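Why Alpha-like neurotoxin BmK-I? Reviewers of the renewal asked for a concrete example.
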Amino acid sequence: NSVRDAYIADSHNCVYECARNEYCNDLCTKNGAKSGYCQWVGKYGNGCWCIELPDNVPIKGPGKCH
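Here is what the prediction returned.
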């Protein structure tokens, strides 16, 4: 799909940890998403969650952070 809700990730399949929701909204929106927030608990633990992130930007998927 063109866009998806998920943990934004780097090129190493690593989530971006967070301490503030604002950090995540900024990170997500500057990468094309509608909004974002900090997940202190979730499928992969602490990390930024983005809403409608374009598919040219990585998301956390099954596998290790390398």
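The domain at 1-66 is CATH 3.30.30.10 (Defensin A-like). This is the kind of structural detail the renewal will allow us to pursue systematically.
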